[PDB]
Write a protein that binds this ligand. Structure first.
Ligand code: K
Ligand code: K
Ligand code: K
Ligand code: K
Ligand code: K
Ligand code: K
Ligand code: MG
Ligand code: MG
Ligand code: MG
Ligand code: MG
Ligand code: MG
Ligand code: MG
Ligand code: MG
Ligand code: MG
Ligand code: MG
Ligand code: MG
Ligand code: MG
Ligand code: MG
Ligand code: MG
Ligand code: MG
Ligand code: MG
Ligand code: MG
Ligand code: MG
Ligand code: MG
Ligand code: MG
Ligand code: MG
Ligand code: MG
Ligand code: MG
Ligand code: MG
Ligand code: MG
Ligand code: MG
Ligand code: MG
Ligand code: MG
Ligand code: MG
Lengths: 48, 177, 48, 46, 163, 44
RNA sequence: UAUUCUCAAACUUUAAAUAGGUAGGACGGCGCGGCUGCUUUGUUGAGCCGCGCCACGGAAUCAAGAGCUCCAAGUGGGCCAUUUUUGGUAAGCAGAACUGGCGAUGCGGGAUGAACCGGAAGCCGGGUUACGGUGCCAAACUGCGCGCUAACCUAGAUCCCACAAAGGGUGUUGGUCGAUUAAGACAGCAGCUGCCGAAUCAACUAGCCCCGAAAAUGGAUGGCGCUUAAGCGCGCGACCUACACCCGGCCGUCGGGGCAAGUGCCAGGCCCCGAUGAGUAGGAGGGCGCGGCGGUCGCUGCAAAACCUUGGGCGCGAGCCUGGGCGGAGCGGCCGUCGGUGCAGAUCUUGGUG
């Protein structure tokens, strides 16, 4: 994994389609920062 | 179909240790907007009520609870604790809704309106389906009438869709109850 | 081969959860091995 | 009068630089009695 | 000098521990120090000779010289953008043998034998340690569930032991 | 379109339904609220 | 003697969080020998040396790489903010600690603002966002929902932020505890009591509103206005909006690669690939322009220089080329080399002119 992952250049994603809620607050508080577990996939769709 | 707030049962325990290979298993019924936030609030109470932090705890099961009969009307009582600008208080509220999710949504909306209490300053102690004869609030009793009857005093005038919206009209709205 | 493995793992997890339910116990899912991290704040005013 | 503001930032521009470490270190400041015998031991080494 | 003496601000650092004053136990004087060993500098307040400057208290260094009553110690010191290798001599009463490398020697031997055993069987392996990884899935037998709920508030309990 | 018409034994299906139904009962189970002796009347 | 209320920057048994030091191999390990004037009762130690053998790199992640030297500029008035913090009643006051920011820096938002929020930038097209917004000013809903408020004080209206307190209200909305009531309460009526036939009384609590609340040019939620809010609290959907992010084009910079029995080249060149672009003080590179000198290639009475032009074109730019006019005798390109070599400022100098 170390070699395979390092081989990948960091992904240059676009601004999320639909925007963010609040980057200044944690996802638990209703914001966008921190661990969102399986909900990262929903964000990946809108940013890829 | 879609609810702002969802009810979950969260089950967790402290990590097994040599002294206790089978630590007690704790369950809670928590309200949150999704699973991730339900888990976070579960560890908040376990940390402060059972002295079990997430770093030394284990998440076992998380399941969402759905209303059994979402087509009928039930009376819901909610016992809650909230923080005001000067301290903490306990209050009991009643609501009428087809699902307890809607009743909990009403509770949060009412607390914000009548008391300026934000969501994070509320702890739900108990919820239950109250039979009509055991209700206490008059806002709920007055609708316990087999012959419920009243007119629509206030109506919202608007086209069915904005497609039929025009700035100018030849005559004023004709309204009657 | 990889496609078959992915489907088997998905069905394997479902079977285990159902098996625990039937016996009245709990099945703790394996902890996530992979994370995807996205930067949501800019490069201004960065603590060291 | 005095302030350490910005001084850590200046230090980290090119630092923190660790000194170059060589396999053999200088013997200056060590016990002369030990050093003198070591010189004789190498002299007669064969 | 220049506004501060040698032992300024050492009221607590150089004071002896509570109920641990008086005679120094003789295991301190029976320690053996060799070149290359690691030692932690801990100033003993009773011994006023060969005592290091307060900066070196609580620092770990490498032994580079041995004398009759003292050991030369190399201590890193950060001055602006550089690290300096400060060489100081300290009486053995102020130094303790450090256990920072206690796991190294034993680890090397275990790695050597594991590679030797794997070499004979032609199986390439790695002896590197790894940090704690994610746990695998498992089943937990059902048991009695204790329900936890928020507690109703009581003002009388907002004080240690109550009002 | 053709309205064309089981993978579990009949006995197994009954056990599955019972286990899930029992699990749901624990999900909606409530505390007895007995440890709150000062708020027994308020909690009902 | 046993208890008890309340305390300490210059008290303390105990004692965090954050931060600080060291270590995680090839400069490792083992075996057999050797050297010594040091060391030991002792080839006992200590360090070093020679030979032989072993050593999958000995936690994670990253590594637009690492080390070393020389010469030298500028600077050595700082200021702001979260937090910790000293003096002071306090200060847009004075002085420290860690980090960031401004200064040196535009750009979007905060009406307006060096420091707040977002975010840092080559020249463009498209897409999407951040903060902030979607009644008009003004790009985007008078969008879909619940409640609260009614201000006869200029009701209220968004971090920094441009203020308001103690204390009060039978204003109104929620909640908490207690008391009373179909065996008849409460108000009134009647002579403790009868008529009376449905709820009533008291305290506390906290939302919004109101009182408390006085200043000098006329004026400021930014303005207009807004009350089935366009106010306040909490939601939902969509939408608007940066020089930020994504895709594409082009310019520069940095790094990488290809090109000779040369059909072979301003190789100081051509071609291909990847990343990247803020800048005061300051440094450096490549270029533009002026006047000579050594050379070289030219122009000119069939019209040189200078000057004029609503002519045209080239270069990111310093500048350059050219049409027409005026003028009437000199001038230019290129290589090298040289210098009294480039102006908007100096209450600059002289002259001229409003
Ligand atoms: K002093
Ligand atoms: K200087
Ligand atoms: K009130
Ligand atoms: K010439
Ligand atoms: K011209
Ligand atoms: K020249
Ligand atoms: Mg990128
Ligand atoms: Mg869109
Ligand atoms: Mg936003
Ligand atoms: Mg911030
Ligand atoms: Mg910021
Ligand atoms: Mg002096
Ligand atoms: Mg000093
Ligand atoms: Mg100066
Ligand atoms: Mg100064
Ligand atoms: Mg000053
Ligand atoms: Mg300046
Ligand atoms: Mg403003
Ligand atoms: Mg654009
Ligand atoms: Mg509206
Ligand atoms: Mg008040
Ligand atoms: Mg405004
Ligand atoms: Mg591009
Ligand atoms: Mg630049
Ligand atoms: Mg010339
Ligand atoms: Mg003109
Ligand atoms: Mg020229
Ligand atoms: Mg001259
Ligand atoms: Mg001059
Ligand atoms: Mg001039
Ligand atoms: Mg000038
Ligand atoms: Mg003048
Ligand atoms: Mg003049
Ligand atoms: Mg004049």
């Amino acid at each position: 994994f170390k070699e395979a992952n390092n081989f990948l250049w960091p992904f240059q994603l676009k601004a999320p389609l639909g925007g963010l809620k609040k980057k200044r607050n944690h996802y638990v508080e209703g914001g966008d920062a921190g661990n969102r577990e399986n909900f990262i996939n929903e964000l990946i769709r809108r940013m890829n | 179909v879609t609810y702002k707030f969802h009810q979950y049962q969260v089950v967790g325990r402290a990590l097994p240790s040599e002294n206790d290979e089978h630590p007690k298993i704790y369950r809670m019924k928590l309200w949150a907007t999704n699973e991730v936030r339900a888990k976070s609030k579960f560890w908040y109470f376990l940390r402060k009520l059972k002295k079990v932090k997430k770093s030394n705890g284990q998440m076992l099961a998380i399941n969402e609870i759905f209303e059994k009969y979402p087509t009928t009307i039930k009376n819901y009582g909610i016992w809650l604790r909230y923080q005001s600008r000067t301290g903490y208080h306990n209050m009991y509220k009643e609501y009428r809704d087809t699902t307890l999710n809607g009743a909990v949504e009403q509770m949060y909306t009412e607390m914000a309106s009548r008391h300026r209490v934000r969501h994070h300053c509320i702890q739900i102690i108990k919820t239950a389906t109250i039979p009509a004869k055991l209700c206490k609030r008059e806002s709920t009793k007055q609708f316990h009438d087999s012959k419920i009857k009243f007119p629509l005093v206030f109506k919202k005038v608007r086209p069915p869709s904005r497609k039929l919206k025009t700035t100018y009209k030849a005559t004023k709205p004709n309204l009657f109850m | 081969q990889y496609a078959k493995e992915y489907s088997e793992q998905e069905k394997e997890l479902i079977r285990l959860k159902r098996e625990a339910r039937l016996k009245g116990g709990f099945y703790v899912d394996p902890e996530a091995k992979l994370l995807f991290i996205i930067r949501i704040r800019g490069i201004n005013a960065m603590p060291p | 009068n005095h302030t350490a503001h910005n001084q850590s930032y200046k230090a980290h521009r090119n630092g923190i630089k660790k000194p170059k470490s060589h396999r053999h270190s200088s013997t200056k400041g060590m016990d002369p009695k030990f050093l003198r015998n070591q010189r004789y031991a190498r002299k007669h080494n064969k | 000098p220049a506004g501060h003496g040698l032992r300024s601000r050492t009221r607590d650092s150089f004071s002896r521990a509570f109920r641990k004053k008086g005679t120094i136990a003789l295991s301190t004087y029976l320690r053996i120090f060799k070149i290359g060993d690691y030692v932690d500098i801990k100033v003993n307040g009773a011994i006023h000779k060969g005592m290091p400057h307060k900066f070196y208290h609580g620092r770990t260094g490498r032994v580079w010289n041995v004398t009759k009553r003292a050991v030369g110690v190399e201590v890193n010191k950060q001055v602006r953008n550089k690290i300096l290798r400060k060489r100081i001599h300290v009486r053995i009463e102020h130094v303790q043998q450090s256990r920072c490398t206690e796991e190294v020697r034993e680890r090397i031997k275990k790695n050597d034998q594991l590679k030797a055993d794997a070499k004979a069987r032609g199986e390439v392996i790695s002896t590197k340690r790894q940090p704690l990884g994610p746990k695998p899935g498992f089943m937990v037998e059902g048991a009695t569930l204790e329900t936890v709920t928020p507690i109703p508030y009581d003002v009388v309990n907002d004080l240690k032991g109550g009002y | 379109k053709e309205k064309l018409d089981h993978a579990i034994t009949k006995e197994e299906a009954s056990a599955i339904k019972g286990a899930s139904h029992s699990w749901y009962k624990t999900m909606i189970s409530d505390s007895d609220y007995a440890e709150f002796d000062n708020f027994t009347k308020w909690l009902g």
